[PDB]
Amino acid sequence: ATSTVTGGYAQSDAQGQMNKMGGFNLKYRYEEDNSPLGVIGSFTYTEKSRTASSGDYNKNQYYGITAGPAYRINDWASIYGVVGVGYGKFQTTEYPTYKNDTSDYGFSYGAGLQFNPMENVALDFSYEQSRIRSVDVGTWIAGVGYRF
Amino acid sequence: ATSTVTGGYAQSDAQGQMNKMGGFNLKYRYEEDNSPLGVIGSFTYTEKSRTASSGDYNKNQYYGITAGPAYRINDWASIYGVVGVGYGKFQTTEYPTYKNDTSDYGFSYGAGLQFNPMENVALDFSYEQSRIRSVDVGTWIAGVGYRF
Amino acid sequence: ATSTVTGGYAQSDAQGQMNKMGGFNLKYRYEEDNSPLGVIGSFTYTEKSRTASSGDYNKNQYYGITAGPAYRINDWASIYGVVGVGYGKFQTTEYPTYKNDTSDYGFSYGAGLQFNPMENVALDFSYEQSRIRSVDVGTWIAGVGYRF
Amino acid sequence: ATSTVTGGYAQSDAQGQMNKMGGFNLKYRYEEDNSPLGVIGSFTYTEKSRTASSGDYNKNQYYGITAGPAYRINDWASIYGVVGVGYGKFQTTEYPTYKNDTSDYGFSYGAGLQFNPMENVALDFSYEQSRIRSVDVGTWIAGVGYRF
Amino acid sequence: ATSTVTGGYAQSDAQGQMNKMGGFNLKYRYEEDNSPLGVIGSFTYTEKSRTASSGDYNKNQYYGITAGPAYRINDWASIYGVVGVGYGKFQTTEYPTYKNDTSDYGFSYGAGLQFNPMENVALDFSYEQSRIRSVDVGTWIAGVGYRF
Amino acid sequence: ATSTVTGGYAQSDAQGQMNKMGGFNLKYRYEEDNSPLGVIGSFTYTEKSRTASSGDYNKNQYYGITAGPAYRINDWASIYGVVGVGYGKFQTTEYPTYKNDTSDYGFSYGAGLQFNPMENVALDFSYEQSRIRSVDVGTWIAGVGYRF
């Protein structure tokens, strides 16, 4: 009966050192008109590239694909929790021509909320966490969209 | 609870001169068994290519991605309105080898109806309009499908 | 209100001779909290490759894309029926360099069931059948997933 | 010591029925300043596509890659003979969606001449023949270029 | 009988405003042991990208493919002249999503020299000029390589 | 004045452990009619893939691109030496989804001979050696071809 589609800026940060990996998030939620329980799917992508004067180049990409239950608390607030899979791809080119690329999948989970300040508008805020090998990647998301 | 999937022929026409740009549309609608309000997403794609004896070639493609509320009026009729984004890509090859390609996005909106002459069948008719720079693109769609 | 996502192993077998074509299936089902009728979409892909000492190589791929109604019988059992389209691609390289590739679409249908031994878990079992030219392809699927 | 590069129009014709398959040829020849014997390599590509009102579509492509000795007879005339490999790719889409593609290699040979009406100019005329399965493909070529 | 292969840095500059477009050049020359006249082919590629704080992005690429006679003056010096074709591709993305891409071919010519300070070593210096529409692109090249 | 084109089987072996990496080589040589010194360019490619019951997969590819002087000793024998660059790409997928890919370039050199048992035929035998990081890759080649 109702769908909400939001998009915004996402920012990841891993165990200390990889700095801030920037990007975006999209979410699609569905609700019934006569039940407070629905579902929400999320797509997050962040990245960062570090080049140089030397020549050494490195590029990190993070993908987060999650889904879970969403619960409407009142006409202007809802909360949700999501689980799924995180994917990271690290590229490194060591001057002048050595190239080494590694990728792996890991478990991902998250939780968020949505507010409806106007009935057809949504403000979305969530946090997502992924493990991937032994590196804990945490991402914060602030989005906006429409409920139709 | 119910979904309806329809597909058909789409035909676009822009501010006068680009002639008839032909193609297709697909829509996916979802309804609850106990609410008349649901949602519908639409995908439209049209195109046209003009070649020659000279050599000058041009190709225009239009993409329309929209979504919105659908309201069931009775067992055989429903109406919906959609909003989203239109995308146009104009290619021109000026003989013998000059190539110039331009693309942009714009706001899109539309409205339609669906009839169910039999309970598991749907007849879909809609009109979509996109702006894209200063060119108003209007597309008419007639589709058929199944409700399951 | 509820979604169930399952994945598993799929195994196809065609009119006698193509042996067992192995692969996978994914399904996405949606249910309302206050109606036993919902919908389920299915994606199946199987394949097989036969090489040699001689050199003759052949590769067969099968894709099945179906959707239909799902009906919840009680808290732990549901049944569904699906219809859609099957696609097959047969590749053959006759030594030392002749290559012949053929592909076509046909009608597909299937039926299955799902059990929920725990409320957020699903066990999925279905059978899918496709025609494609004059070759009847039948595929068996056993999957597992989560309901959220 | 000297090179000649020519390009022109090529036209193939196979055992009767495939009509005229149109396209192009490029050749690169090399000569020594103090020997009349040199070498020449050739690249030929032709094609034809037949569409419809019905829907049946077919596309034929021919590639010819050959090389051999070139002999300069006087300051304005040379003759050459080439051998190598021909490649043909036949595509057929039988309405509404059956697709069948076949390709194979075969022996190719050819012979030609070049005239130099001015010392830095060349006029090239050759004929190429390929077998490929049991289909004899014969191609005529008329090119022009520069000797530097 | 002898070949020389050199590579180096290339830098283009067009009618005033496009600044310095950086890149590389490769050349392959061939000589006979008993004639001072031979041939040389050249491949040049340069580029430049300008991004921003605003968002407007532009990317210019230049390709130069030329060939011509090379004349050995003594054991350590040779001169050559080349002619061929220049290709330029200008990309521009006007924020937030307008994209306009244009490309064309034009005549190219150049001239250079090579020194052999040691018999198996070469130092290459040349200048290339291309027109392309009405924009005169001039490129300077300094390369090094081996004669074998 | 004369060219010789040969192709054959190549087999690489690295410092002990990577076993036998199989593949091919192509060479193009050019000779003048009145000098025993000419040039020859070589392209070598070998590979090996190791899969499993477990799931761990690894794939190694080796590319060798070399060129150098060729000297004709008599009407039936010639010797040559080549230098250039070797490239290796090692892929490893650690079950169930970790992927790690590394590539680098290194110096390559080789030496060979060619016999002409008949004037338009050639038998080619060479050995190529590449370093690439700290791994010494040695490849043996036996080819056949035509002199025209």
Swiss-Prot record, chains A, B, C, D, E, F:
Keyword Metal-binding carried by entry: no
Record's GO cellular component terms: cell outer membrane; host outer membrane
Membrane topology, record value: Multi-pass membrane protein
Name of the protein in question: Outer membrane protein X
Keyword Membrane: yes
Residue intervals annotated with topology Periplasmic: 1-2, 32-36, 73-76, 117-120, 148
Family: Belongs to the outer membrane OOP (TC 1.B.6) superfamily. OmpX family.
Record key words, sorted: Cell outer membrane, Membrane, Signal, Transmembrane, Transmembrane beta strand
InterPro entries: Bact_OM_Invasion-Related (IPR051723), Enterovir_OMP (IPR000758), OMP/PagP_b-brl (IPR011250), OMP_b-brl (IPR027385)
PROSITE patterns per the UniProt record, alphabetical: ENT_VIR_OMP_1, ENT_VIR_OMP_2
Domain of life: Bacteria
Record topological domains on the Extracellular side: 13-21, 47-62, 87-106, 131-137
Annotated TM spans: 3-12, 22-31, 37-46, 63-72, 77-86, 107-116, 121-130, 138-147
Localization of this protein: Cell outer membrane
